[PDB]
Each structure stands twice: as C-alpha cells, then as structure tokens.
Design a protein around this nucleic acid. Structure first.
Ligand SMILES: Cc1cnc(N)c2[nH]cnc12
Length: 231
DNA sequence: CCCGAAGTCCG
DNA sequence: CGGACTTTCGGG
C-alpha cells in the first residue's frame, strides 16, 4: 500500500527545502536522538500550508493514518508537522483518542514532542472528562517510561483555577524521588506555572515537602520575590 | 516590539 | 549545585 499521497507530497516538499548546515546544530540541540532536515518552524509551517493549499487537508477518516505515517519518517520535522496537522483536526479529537495519544508519547519520544501533546491535547480531554484521569494516571506513574510519568505531571499545566490541587500534589509526591532530569524539571515547571494562580499553596508545598533541589528552585523562581529569602 | 517557556559553559 | 548566558518558539 503506498504512502498516503498527502504525506508523500509533504515529504517531497520538505526535502526540496532541506538545509544540512542548519540540520547539524538542530540535531545536536536534541542530543542527536533524531535526524533533521534543517527546517525551522516558520518555514516548516509555510511548507505545510503549501501542501494543504494544493491537496486540501485529508478526510478525517485518515487523520490517525497520516499522523502515524509522519511519526514513522526519520527526520524530526515530520513529527513537528504531524503535531501541526493534529491541531487542524482538534475538533474531532475526544476521550476515545487517549490510547492513540499515549502511543505518540512513547514513540520517537523527547521533550519537543511530548510537551506538545500533553498540556494541550491530553489536558483538554481530561478537563472535559476528569472521571477518566484515574483510568490512566496511576499506570503512567508506575510505568518504566519517563515520558508517561512526565505526562502525568504536566497534563494539568494550563488548568489555572481548574487545577485539582490534591491530585497535583499526590502525583508530585509519587515522583519526587526520581533522579531523572525530565521528571524533576517537569515538577518544577508545573509548580512554577500553578504558582501564577495560587502562589501561597505552592510556597507552602515547597517549604514543607521533599523535592529535588532542581524542582524546588524552578518552582519558586518567581514567587521567591513575594516571600523573601530568609537568612 | 515585548516577555517567559530546552541548551552550553563555568566556578 | 546553580548562576550566567544562548537561540527558538508562542503568546501578549
Ligand atoms: C524551554 C526554554 C526555556 N528557556 C529558554 N530561555 C529557552 N530557549 C529556548 N527554549 C527555552
């Protein structure tokens, strides 16, 4: 079965504009886990738009197929484009897509893909269907996969007043002893972000519960100005 | 335009 | 460990 024509067209058009000189530092930035074509976001967005203009966005029946096929291509720009495409199908994504999103998280995994899946796509799903959180979060925390653990921490990133504080702090407590940078830093980020909404709760939490030094320092980067640094 | 959100280098 | 500094991206 041939590659979906939309994917083939995107592959041809991106490849015709590759920049091997830029690809080298771009690949190093992601610690050489991926090949890059060397196309930065502004041009990558225009090249995708070119293909949508010519071919039209595929029928929704092929949404998951297109994303998978792009996920399977070697160069990282194809996963970035896949996430751009998934946003275009946003109004068609719902709770039945959680496993599909899980599988994207755990394949071709790094912060650049995971952080564009979790707080937006999964965040929106669990905001509408909070009763489904306990069908996934416990498994994610218990798994060997650091990106699922990071997903458990960051899905509520943007919740603001809708943050489930007890849940957030329970998740952090489960993962606070992790030596993994991407876990320590995710804890730092979610606390720093939630502190923009409820600084007193975050301050009390970090002063009275164990965290990796990195996590605590990142959490209070801004709010330490409000409370002061005791001698 | 601005600001706030991985990476290297150094003590 | 953590400060100083870097580019790229998204949002205001
Ligand atoms: C995630 C992140 C944080 N801070 C910066 N100064 C960055 N520059 C590029 N990504 C960044």
């Amino acid at each position: 079965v041939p590659m979906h024509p939309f994917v083939k067209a995107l592959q041809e058009h991106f490849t015709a504009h590759q920049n091997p000189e830029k690809a080298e530092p771009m690949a190093r930035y992601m610690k050489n886990h991926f090949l890059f074509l060397g196309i930065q976001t502004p041009e990558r967005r225009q090249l995708l738009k070119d293909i949508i203009q010519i071919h039209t966005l595929p029928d929704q029946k092929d949404f998951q197929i297109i994303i998978r096929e792009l996920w399977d291509l070697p160069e990282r720009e194809f996963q970035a484009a896949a996430l751009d495409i998934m946003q275009k199908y946003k109004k068609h994504i719902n709770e039945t897509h959680i496993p599909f999103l899980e599988e994207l998280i755990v394949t071709k995994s790094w912060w650049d893909s995971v952080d564009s899946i979790v707080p937006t796509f999964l965040g929106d799903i669990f905001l509408k269907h909070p009763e489904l959180i306990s069908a996934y979060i416990p498994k994610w925390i218990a798994s060997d996969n650091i990106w699922l653990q990071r997903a458990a921490i960051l899905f509520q990133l943007k919740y603001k007043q809708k943050m489930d504080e007890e849940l957030l702090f329970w998740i952090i407590g489960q993962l606070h002893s992790s030596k993994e940078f991407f876990i320590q830093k995710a804890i730092g980020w979610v606390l720093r972000e939630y502190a923009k909404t409820n600084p007193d709760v975050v301050w009390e939490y970090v002063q009275n519960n164990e965290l990796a030094p990195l996590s605590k320092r990142e959490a209070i980067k801004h709010i330490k100005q409000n409370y002061g640094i005791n001698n």
